[PDB]
Amino acid sequence: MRIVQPVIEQLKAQSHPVCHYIYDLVGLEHHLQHITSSLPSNCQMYYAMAANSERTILDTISQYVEGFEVASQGEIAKGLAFKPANHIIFGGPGKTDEELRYAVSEGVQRIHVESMHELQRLNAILEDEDKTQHILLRVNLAGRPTQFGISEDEVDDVIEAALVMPNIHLDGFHFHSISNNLDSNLHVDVVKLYFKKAKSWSEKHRFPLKHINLGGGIGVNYADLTSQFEWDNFVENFKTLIVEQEMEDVTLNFECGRFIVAHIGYYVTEVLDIKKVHGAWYAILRGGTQQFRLPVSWQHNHPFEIYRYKDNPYSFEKVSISRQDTTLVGQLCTPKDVFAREVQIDAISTGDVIVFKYAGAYGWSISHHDFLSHPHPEFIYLT
Amino acid sequence: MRIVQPVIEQLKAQSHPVCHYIYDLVGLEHHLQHITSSLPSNCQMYYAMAANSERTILDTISQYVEGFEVASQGEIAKGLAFKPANHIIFGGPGKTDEELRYAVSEGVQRIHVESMHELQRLNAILEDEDKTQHILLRVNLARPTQFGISEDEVDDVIEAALVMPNIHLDGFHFHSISNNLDSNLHVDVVKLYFKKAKSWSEKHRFPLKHINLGGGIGVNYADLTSQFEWDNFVENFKTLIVEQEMEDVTLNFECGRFIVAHIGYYVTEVLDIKKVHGAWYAILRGGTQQFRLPVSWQHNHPFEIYRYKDNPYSFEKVSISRQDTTLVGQLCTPKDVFAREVQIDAISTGDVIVFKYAGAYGWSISHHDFLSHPHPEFIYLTQ
Numbered sequence: 001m002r003i004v005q006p007v008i009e010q011l012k013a014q015s016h017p018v019c020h021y022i023y024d025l026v027g028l029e030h031h032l033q034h035i036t037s038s039l040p041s042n043c044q045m046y047y048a049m050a051a052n053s054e055r056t057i058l059d060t061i062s063q064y065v066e067g068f069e070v071a072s073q074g075e076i077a078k079g080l081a082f083k084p085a086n087h088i089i090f091g092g093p094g095k096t097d098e099e100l101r102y103a104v105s106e107g108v109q110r111i112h113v114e115s116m117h118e119l120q121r122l123n124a125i126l127e128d129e130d131k132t133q134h135i136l137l138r139v140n141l142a143g144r145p146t147q148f149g150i151s152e153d154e155v156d157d158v159i160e161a162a163l164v165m166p167n168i169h170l171d172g173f174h175f176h177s178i179s180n181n182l183d184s185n186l187h188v189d190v191v192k193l194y195f196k197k198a199k200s201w202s203e204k205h206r207f208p209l210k211h212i213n214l215g216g217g218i219g220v221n222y223a224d225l226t227s228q229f230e231w232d233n234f235v236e237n238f239k240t241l242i243v244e245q246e247m248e249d250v251t252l253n254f255e256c257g258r259f260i261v262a263h264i265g266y267y268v269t270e271v272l273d274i275k276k277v278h279g280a281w282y283a284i285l286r287g288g289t290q291q292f293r294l295p296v297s298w299q300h301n302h303p304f305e306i307y308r309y310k311d312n313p314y315s316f317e318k319v320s321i322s323r324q325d326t327t328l329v330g331q332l333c334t335p336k337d338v339f340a341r342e343v344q345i346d347a348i349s350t351g352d353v354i355v356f357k358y359a360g361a362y363g364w365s366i367s368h369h370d371f372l373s374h375p376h377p378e379f380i381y382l383t
Numbered sequence: 384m385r386i387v388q389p390v391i392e393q394l395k396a397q398s399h400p401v402c403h404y405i406y407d408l409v410g411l412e413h414h415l416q417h418i419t420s421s422l423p424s425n426c427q428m429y430y431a432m433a434a435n436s437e438r439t440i441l442d443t444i445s446q447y448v449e450g451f452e453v454a455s456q457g458e459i460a461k462g463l464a465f466k467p468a469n470h471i472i473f474g475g476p477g478k479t480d481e482e483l484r485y486a487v488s489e490g491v492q493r494i495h496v497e498s499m500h501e502l503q504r505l506n507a508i509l510e511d512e513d514k515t516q517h518i519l520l521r522v523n524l525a526r527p528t529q530f531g532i533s534e535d536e537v538d539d540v541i542e543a544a545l546v547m548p549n550i551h552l553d554g555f556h557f558h559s560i561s562n563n564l565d566s567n568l569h570v571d572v573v574k575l576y577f578k579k580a581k582s583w584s585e586k587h588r589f590p591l592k593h594i595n596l597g598g599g600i601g602v603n604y605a606d607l608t609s610q611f612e613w614d615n616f617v618e619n620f621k622t623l624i625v626e627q628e629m630e631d632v633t634l635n636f637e638c639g640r641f642i643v644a645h646i647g648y649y650v651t652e653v654l655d656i657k658k659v660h661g662a663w664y665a666i667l668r669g670g671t672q673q674f675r676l677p678v679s680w681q682h683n684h685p686f687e688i689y690r691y692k693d694n695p696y697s698f699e700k701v702s703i704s705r706q707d708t709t710l711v712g713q714l715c716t717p718k719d720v721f722a723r724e725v726q727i728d729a730i731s732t733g734d735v736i737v738f739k740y741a742g743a744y745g746w747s748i749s750h751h752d753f754l755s756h757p758h759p760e761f762i763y764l765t766q
């Protein structure tokens with residue numbers, strides 16, 4: 001509340017309707033300074049802009065991170081606004097010929113190759129353009145069947161194919177098995193598996209293990225806001241693992257999105273209407289889940305807080321309820337437009353503002369902005 | 384495939400990437416002509432543009448339908464380009480003061496009021512502007528959703544509406560069910576709307592001018608041959624108007640899905656084919672951020688396969704036959720799935736997947752800019 005309330009009160013004082021995204025850039029910079037500086041000298045931090053690729057967010061982040069992790073030519077173009085191509089790293093299971101040629105043309109640092117067929121499509125462009133390209137092979141370790149990377153048993157044949165292509169520079173491997181892990185001790189064991197796997201292929205095939213992309217998937221807790229990822233405990237144990245496994249001459253990198261921008265983002269919206277239907281209570285808010293789809297996608301009740309507005313703009317009384325199971329919804333004409341279902345609300349009124357915390361990662365970026373053609377939420381960036 | 388194959392062959396012949404929404408406007412016109420002509424003279428068809436508000440689709444639709452059903456200021460704005468204000472009807476659970484003032488200013492045909500507080504906000508705007516407005520009251524007949532007025536509360540809102548001089552109560556709005564495939568069950572629901580609507584008008588002593596019977600006409604995605612029996616529905620619907628003495632009561636539907644579903648196609652080329660831990664995958668251009676319907680509804684979306692004979696690359700295609708295969712897009716999320724473990728007769732890299740019945744809630748519900756991919760090209764077939 002402390003961060004957003006001065007903004008909400010200004011909007012109320014000016015009679016502007018509250019349907020906003022608010023981002024705390026000071027807290028973002030402070031958070032990034034700590035994370036990147038704690039890392040060892042051989043490890044790097046790339047920002048995965050999937051979580052949030054708003055231009056102001058990238059402007060702020062660029063200074064503190066090594067580079068950007070991108071999943072398309074459009075994300076490359078957004079990254080090139082603030083970083084050189086050789087600090088952009090390109091992953092994804094379906095990179096088109098256009099994207100590969102554009103990536104090669106711009107000269108992106110690495111392409112994280114996810115198949116034998118992709119390798120050959122890339123290599124054909126490299127022979128055509130007469131360029132070379134640093135790559136990692138993305139590996140899918142035996143957890144379940146997904147579309148991502150090379151299946152573990154197929155990896156050997158893709159290594160041998162990449163090594164005999166002179167235009168390909170096989171730096172090493174890319175692992176991204178999990179997303180949203182909250183356990184720091186467990187994440188260290190995932191990294192240990194990556195080191196042992198990467199070293200075994202390097203030793204079997206006899207090529208220099210130059211680089212390992214350890215992926216991302218550093219979790220954010222939406223249920224319990226006090227129990228976040230123990231980054232300091234992780235980093236210090238992660239440092240111990242590097243020296244134990246002798247990975248000091250191997251350059252490492254993470255590609256984090258959610259953990260970097262989640263807690264610094266807020267989706268704030270005014271209460272338009274409160275109603276009781278067949279027993280159940282509902283609070284209808286401005287905007288909707290087409291602007292903030294995270295709770296519907298993940299199927300949880302998103303954490304929020306209620307700013308109690310004291311004035312009344314109408315000549316008639318506000319609708320108020322107290323201590324009821326209340327379902328929070330937007331303006332959409334679908335029953336799926338639900339921020340939170342049957343959650344406790346101590347006091348809520350028409351004219352109050354719901355402050356959804358932890359809205360900065362995969363909030364606006366995953367949302368179906370133009371469904372039912374509502375106007376976009378307004379964007380405020382605090383400095 | 385007869386409709387889309389000429390377009391696919393043109394794209395391959397021109398060496399353009401295949402990632403397209405293709406629409407059959409000739410088919411759309413024949414569908415509209417069939418529906419609009421078959422209705423009784425006291426009932427009109429409005430198009431609920433949430434399903435598809437593309438300007439070419441609206442232009443084609445506006446020629447045949449009575450008007451547009453809208454649920455935001457943006458949908459009103461789109462509708463006004465092709466219909467006049469007095470053939471636009473406005474619903475939705477969270478109409479803002481700005482949207483209500485806009486609707487009144489433009490002079491919309493009806494506003495479908497969904498609560499007591501909305502009625503009072505509308506009335507306050509009407510007294511300020513010194514205007515009147517025809518309305519219906521949206522009723523929620525006895526499961527709980529956020530929509531309309533709870534049945535027990537209806538009497539109080541009617542009495543409040545009748546006392547307001549600026550409000551002109553035409554009657555009621557019912558939209559209980561969604562995606563119903565049985566014509567006979569829909570007639571019973573329409574009969575139930577008549578019984579309830581008359582009961583309120585006789586009790587409260589005002590003329591029952593209009594009843595909005597909603598949409599909810601289903602489209603079958605599992606079995607394409609077993610669609611909604613419109614001809615069967617309309618004749619029993621005509622019978623019912625006479626039985627319940629509703630010839631002088633003027634009516635309307637508000638259909639979205641049923642109008643545009645079968646005439647739209649989402650067409651995309653196979654970029655990769657891989658095996659991961661025993662399971663086959665086909666990576667397609669675009670993704671569920673362009674066509675979200677399969678993920679939202681959690682089904683295997685119906686499709687056909689166009690085989691392409693030529694090979695643009697000097698290395699071999701990946702070709703499979705008679706395999707259970709998961710179809711995925713370019714996205715970096717494992718939720719990017721068009722269809723899961725579906726038996727495919729034969730497929731190679733460079734072939735084209737043709738997702739049928741992609742015209743309703745395809746592009747319109749999708750998260751277009753997630754991972755910043757370029758939009759698919761839009762073709763509208765007219766000859």
Ligand SMILES: Cc1ncc(COP(=O)(O)O)c(CNCCNC(=O)C[C@](O)(CC(=O)O)C(=O)O)c1O
Pocket residue numbers: 333334335336431433434452474475558561562597598599600637638639640641679680744748
């Ligand atoms: C008032 C009113 N009138 C008419 C209609 C149109 O109904 P019909 O098209 O069915 O005839 C609707 C449906 N309102 C839109 C219903 N939405 C959908 O069917 C798709 C989706 O929104 C997908 C998603 O967002 O995940 C969903 O909830 O499944 C409506 O709410």
Ligand SMILES: NCCNC(=O)C[C@](O)(CC(=O)O)C(=O)O
Pocket residue numbers: 179180297298362366716717718
């Ligand atoms: N699954 C863990 C990774 N989550 C995200 O990165 C967010 C999203 O991509 C957003 C979404 O498309 O629903 C998702 O897959 O839930």
